[PDB]
Design an enzyme around this catalytic site. Structure first.
Site, PDB file in Angstrom:
ATOM      1  N   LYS B  23       0.841  -1.195   0.000  1.00  0.00           N
ATOM      2  CA  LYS B  23       0.000   0.000   0.000  1.00  0.00           C
ATOM      3  C   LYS B  23       0.877   1.246   0.000  1.00  0.00           C
ATOM      4  O   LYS B  23       2.014   1.225   0.479  1.00  0.00           O
ATOM      5  CB  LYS B  23      -0.967   0.027   1.197  1.00  0.00           C
ATOM      6  N   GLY B  25      -0.035   5.624   0.221  1.00  0.00           N
ATOM      7  CA  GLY B  25      -0.927   6.761   0.136  1.00  0.00           C
ATOM      8  C   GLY B  25      -0.812   7.725   1.299  1.00  0.00           C
ATOM      9  O   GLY B  25      -0.652   7.299   2.450  1.00  0.00           O
ATOM     10  N   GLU B  27       0.765  10.174   3.388  1.00  0.00           N
ATOM     11  CA  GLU B  27       1.519  10.183   4.641  1.00  0.00           C
ATOM     12  C   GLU B  27       1.871   8.753   5.051  1.00  0.00           C
ATOM     13  O   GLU B  27       2.302   8.505   6.182  1.00  0.00           O
ATOM     14  CB  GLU B  27       0.731  10.942   5.730  1.00  0.00           C
ATOM     15  N   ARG B  29       3.815   5.052   3.383  1.00  0.00           N
ATOM     16  CA  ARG B  29       4.206   4.003   2.449  1.00  0.00           C
ATOM     17  C   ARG B  29       4.395   2.702   3.219  1.00  0.00           C
ATOM     18  O   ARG B  29       5.027   2.695   4.277  1.00  0.00           O
ATOM     19  CB  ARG B  29       5.492   4.363   1.701  1.00  0.00           C
ATOM     20  N   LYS B  43       7.357   0.633   6.794  1.00  0.00           N
ATOM     21  CA  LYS B  43       6.583   1.850   7.004  1.00  0.00           C
ATOM     22  C   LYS B  43       7.496   3.032   6.735  1.00  0.00           C
ATOM     23  O   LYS B  43       8.594   3.119   7.298  1.00  0.00           O
ATOM     24  CB  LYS B  43       5.988   1.915   8.413  1.00  0.00           C
ATOM     25  N   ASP B 145      -5.197   8.462  17.006  1.00  0.00           N
ATOM     26  CA  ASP B 145      -6.438   8.090  16.353  1.00  0.00           C
ATOM     27  C   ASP B 145      -6.802   6.665  16.741  1.00  0.00           C
ATOM     28  O   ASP B 145      -6.395   5.714  16.069  1.00  0.00           O
ATOM     29  CB  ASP B 145      -6.300   8.230  14.837  1.00  0.00           C
TER      30      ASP B 145
END
Lengths: 84, 230, 334, 50, 174
Positions: B23, B25, B27, B29, B43, B145
């Site tokens: 994946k 996108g 902010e 990788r 990351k 979050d």
């Protein structure tokens, strides 16, 4: 409980209803101790102001009376009142 | 100096040419592969955005360093967190090992409702989740979050051992204002991903606010948010 | 229909004549002041009264319309200033009761955003919006305007303009313009606080900090103000466009518009463009005068808040000191 | 048919003032009306300020 | 012994040797410092696996082939890259060879044609060849975790390989 009543004489009831309305609905920046009573009688307009401190009292008085004066200069520059 | 950076270009080309998509996108990788025999994933934060140099380097550097510090403090505190290998900020890389048993609290709440009616064991999952989020909030490492898709589970499938990951938008200076912000995003994720879990969410809220001696000014600042929309 | 947008909020006045999709008259007497002294409730009123009949007549003769060809009297319902709005208002209510027109209240910020919708013409984009009194990242979500970006203290318009104030630059035409064209001649940028706390900004930390520069910008003589100009350009335009693309990708939107107190700058156009190219997004332009508080924008927002059917209670209306776009009930759109 | 007003606080005594307006037929009364406007401003000030 | 194919700057071949029956302080350490021993000599009683060595050696390879490294020699770098103790004095002294062992682990890193004869070093240092499965026997956990001081709560959800890995990652930024 300072009270101040005033009778502005207009030419027709048109100005009576106008200068009653066009300054009534505003819950003034300071009605904390001030009551604005706008009673139309024929073509005359009685207005009674209620206050407890004379500073904001005078401010309301003169501010209003110049909103009045501005209604007047508009009824001189756009008016006099048209039949509605 | 630029010669070491040319060698870094060479290594970035070599290690990352011929790998499948995982994946990428906004902010983040993220890739996946091997490491000396072990399994690992990638990351990546970056100075790969162009608004101005002389800060973009500082930007990506502090970003990745914060994420590394967060993973370390998290798994060292006692919260279940992944294991990190080494942090080379010269390109802002992150090598994180995978913990097997791929399942999210999202997936659990999704799957166990077939046998559960008027959630009781899901309310108990909520009890445990409140316990572990209060455990994270012991020294208040803000996941920044919290979510239903951010809570993994490692076996056994009965004692409810769960892992908290992705501490990239993180900070530890917890203000009950921002804490209520967190809990609000929390409830929003509940309501969005899960339709009408008011019994589940109430079990969860009571479990946490009991297991946490701090939720009072947090929820008060949340109420402050409720009357101004922050 | 025609709309008399009777706007004057703190340092401004203007009559937006909106009719048939054009802002025919946006006249004014920008209450230009001694260097960095304004935000007046009293003399704003004196000025506005003295000039308001003149401005009315000016706009009317420019347009060539009568007191029976105007179709609305849209006064700024808020959030403006206390006395400027009531003095703005008594004329609105009077020409309403006399010209036979209805009093209509209109939010302020929705005016900026509606003139932006006339500027952009794009599919419901998020909007970074900042003026002398707003710092919001907005999207129209769940039937209302959703606040995703919200300050507590100050505003990019307010911030950049108070900055250009405390450096006593030529207040006309807009302090923003002065800090924009005063920029290019300075180097050696510095690090000022970068405070993005997840989707909400706190611009206070920005402004105060640059103030603490001026002292050592004069006590050591090793830095120029153009440095400060270019530095605040880069920094705050970064913060804004970064959280803009963030809350953009969040909601599935790839559009961005900047309107209000600081839209005059072009450095922001550049940085928005770069963050857009990188993240695959697209930008929208900006300008000086339109993003300055004319009377046209309130007439525009009145076009919507009035065409629908929203009337104000003839017996209660007027003074406001806060009126939020999620305290609104937007109805003209689903 | 004249700018008429009256103030009574807790004095219990009538402070009644009024000024004539311009008689129409040679012009609009509004001129004498603004006259009385200035007049009442002067009066309320000079009475209440001290 | 066995040779590998390192990654993350792959240009090197790492090789491990295990010897025993050693007792002397100065001569062998000088042999190491003088370069007449081309390997890297480590005590066996603080290590848990060859994977810790592998990670530290990958750190060494990467920071070397950029020259940015605090070090200047591949040999001395891995030894510091095992111990996360930022006081390099003990990260070199303790984690390396001391006089407290009758056995030694040797780590060699080979680039291209730089070859060092095995029997040469076997002659250089006294000891018998022993296979590499004797790690757990000399492994004395009482002193291994003394340098980590790790929480049992972390051990509850994994092994002690990743428990000692997660903390060697972070000595550079802090």
């Amino acid at each position: 409980p300072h009270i101040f009543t005033l009778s502005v004489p207009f030419p027709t009831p048109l100005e009576a209803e106008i200068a009653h309305g066009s300054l009534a609905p505003d819950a003034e920046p300071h009605q904390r101790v001030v009551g604005k009573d706008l009673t139309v009688s024929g073509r005359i307009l009685v207005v009674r102001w209620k206050a407890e401190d004379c500073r904001l009292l005078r401010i309301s008085v003169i501010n209003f009376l110049d909103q009045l004066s501005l209604v007047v200069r508009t009824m001189q520059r756009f008016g006099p009142p048209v039949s509605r | 100096e630029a010669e070491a950076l040319a060698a870094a270009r060479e290594r970035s080309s070599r290690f990352l040419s011929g790998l499948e998509l995982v994946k990428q996108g906004a902010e983040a990788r993220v890739f996946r592969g091997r490491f000396q025999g072990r399994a690992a994933v990638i990351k990546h934060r970056f100075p790969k955005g162009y608004r101005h140099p002389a800060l973009e380097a500082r930007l990506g550097r502090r970003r990745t360093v914060q994420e590394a510090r967060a993973l370390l403090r998290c798994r060292r505190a006692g919260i279940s967190a992944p294991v990190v290998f080494f942090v080379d900020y010269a390109s802002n890389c992150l090598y994180m090992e995978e913990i097997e048993g791929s399942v999210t609290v999202r997936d659990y709440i999704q799957s166990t409702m077939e046998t559960e009616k008027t959630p009781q064991g899901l309310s108990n999952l909520a009890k445990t989740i409140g316990q572990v989020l209060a455990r994270m909030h012991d020294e208040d490492l803000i996941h920044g979050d919290l979510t239903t898709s951010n809570m993994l589970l490692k076996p056994p499938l009965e004692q409810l051992n769960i892992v908290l990951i992705d501490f990239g938008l993180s900070f530890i200076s917890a203000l009950p204002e921002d804490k209520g912000v967190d809990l609000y995003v929390l409830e929003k994720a509940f309501l969005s991903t899960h339709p009408n879990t008011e019994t589940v969410f109430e079990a969860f809220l009571k479990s946490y606010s009991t297991s946490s001696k701090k939720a009072r000014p947090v929820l008060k600042k949340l109420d402050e948010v409720r009357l101004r929309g922050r | 229909p025609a709309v008399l947008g009777f706007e004057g909020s703190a340092n401004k006045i203007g009559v937006g004549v909106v009719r048939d999709g054009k802002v025919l008259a946006n006249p004014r007497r920008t209450y230009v002041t001694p260097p960095g002294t304004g935000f007046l409730p009293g003399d704003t009123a004196r000025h506005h009264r003295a000039v308001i009949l003149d401005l009315l007549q000016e706009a009317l003769t420019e347009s060539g319309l009568t007191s029976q060809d105007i179709d609305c009297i849209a006064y700024t319902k808020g959030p403006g200033m206390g006395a400027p709005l009531v003095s703005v208002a008594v004329v609105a209510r009077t020409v309403a009761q006399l010209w036979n027109k209805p009093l209509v209240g209109v939010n302020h910020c929705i005016g900026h955003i509606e003139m932006g919708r006339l500027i952009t013409g794009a599919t419901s984009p998020t909007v970074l919006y900042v003026s002398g009194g707003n710092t919001q990242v907005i999207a129209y979500s769940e039937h209302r305007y959703r606040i995703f970006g919200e300050t507590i203290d100050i505003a990019v318009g307010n911030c950049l303009d108070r900055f250009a104030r405390v450096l006593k630059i030529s207040n006309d035409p807009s302090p923003g313009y002065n800090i924009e064209q005063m920029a290019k001649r300075g180097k050696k940028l510095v690090e000022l606080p970068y405070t993005v706390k997840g989707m909400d900004v706190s611009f206070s930390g920005i402004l105060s900090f640059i103030e603490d520069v001026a002292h050592r910008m004069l006590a050591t003589g090793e830095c120029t103000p153009e440095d400060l100009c270019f530095s605040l350009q880069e920094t705050v335009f970064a913060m804004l466009v970064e959280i803009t693309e963030r809350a953009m990708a969040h909601c599935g939107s790839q559009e961005a518009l900047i309107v209000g107190g600081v839209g005059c700058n072009v450095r922001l156009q550049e940085m928005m463009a770069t963050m857009c190219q990188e993240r695959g997004a697209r930008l929208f332009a900006t300008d000086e005068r339109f993003c300055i508080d004319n009377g046209a924008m309130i007439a525009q927002a009145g076009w919507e808040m009035f065409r629908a059917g929203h009337r104000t209670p003839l017996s209660d209306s007027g003074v406001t000191q806060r009126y939020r776009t999620d305290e609104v009930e937007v109805t003209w759109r689903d | 048919m004249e700018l008429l007003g009256e103030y009574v606080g807790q004095e219990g005594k009538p402070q009644k003032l009024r000024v004539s307006c311009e008689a129409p037929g040679d012009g609009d009364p509004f001129q004498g009306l603004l006259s009385g406007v200035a007049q009442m401003k002067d009066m309320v000030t000079e009475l209440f300020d001290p | 012994q066995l040779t590998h194919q390192l990654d993350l700057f792959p240009e090197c071949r790492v090789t491990l040797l295990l010897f025993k029956d050693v007792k002397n302080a100065g001569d062998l350490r000088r042999k190491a410092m003088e370069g007449t021993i081309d390997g890297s000599l480590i005590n066996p009683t603080v290590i848990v696996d060859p994977f810790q060595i592998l990670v530290a050696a990958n750190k060494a390879v990467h920071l070397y082939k950029l020259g940015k490294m605090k070090t200047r020699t591949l040999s001395t770098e891995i030894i510091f890259n095992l111990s996360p103790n930022n006081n390099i004095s003990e990260a070199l002294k303790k984690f390396g060879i001391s006089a407290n062992d009758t056995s030694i682990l040797i780590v060699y890193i080979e680039e291209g044609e730089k070859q060092i004869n095995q029997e040469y070093l076997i002659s250089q240092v006294e000891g018998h060849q022993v296979s590499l499965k004797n790690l757990p026997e000399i492994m004395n956990i009482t002193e291994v975790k003394k340098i980590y001081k790790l929480s049992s709560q972390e051990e509850s959800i994994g092994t002690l390989l990743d428990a000692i890995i997660c903390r060697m990652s972070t000595k550079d930024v802090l």
